[PDB]
Design a protein around this ligand. Sequence first.
Ligand SMILES: O=C(O)C(=O)N[C@@H](CSCc1ccc2ccccc2c1)C(=O)O
Ligand SMILES: [Fe+3]
Length: 199
Amino acid sequence: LAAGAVILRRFAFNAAEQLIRDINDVASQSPFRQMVTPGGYTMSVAMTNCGHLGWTTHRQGYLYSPIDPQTNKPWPAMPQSFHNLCQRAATAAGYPDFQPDACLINRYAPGAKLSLHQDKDEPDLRAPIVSVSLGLPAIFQFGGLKRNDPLKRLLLEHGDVVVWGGESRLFYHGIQPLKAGFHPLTIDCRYNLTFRQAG
Ligand SMILES: O=C(O)C(=O)N[C@@H](CSCc1ccc2ccccc2c1)C(=O)O
Ligand SMILES: [Fe+3]
């Protein structure tokens, strides 16, 4: 399916309410914002981060920064719920040493999407990324190592966690425009957490 990826469906289902509380807490400090791409377009996905580092635009490029450029303060500390869930998932998937210092939190309103990309900016690409999906379902599309590799699609639903290791860590991937709907925990949106070793 995706070589090296370990899909754990509903792994975060029981933790989801706490996770969402923690997302709200994080956002009360560093608010969700829609970043501007180099190229000048406003992303449809809104973002924030927690942990020592967080992903952001700066100076018409992207990077991991210890300071949130919007507040000029550090990103909020990584919530225990986040840290512990990530560790359980990574450990089950065979990455017991994974120690994320960054968690990017993506929020999707109806229609929001994430264009096909690789995550290339972490210092060691042997370290996995761990995603946790919450709320409304989204169609995840994924390629291969080359931009033009044939795309496959799978639905990511509430509570689904995936550890993207091995070859899959390098795949081009994205999220297709979110279908509108209702979810009891998130109301009208989807959240996705991605845990990274950025330092
Ligand atoms: O944050 C990202 O970089 C990202 O692409 N997030 C999407 C997709 S989740 C699945 C996912 C996340 C990160 C990956 C990083 C490397 C390879 C495969 C990945 C798959 C989202 O917000 O739902
Ligand atoms: Fe990505």
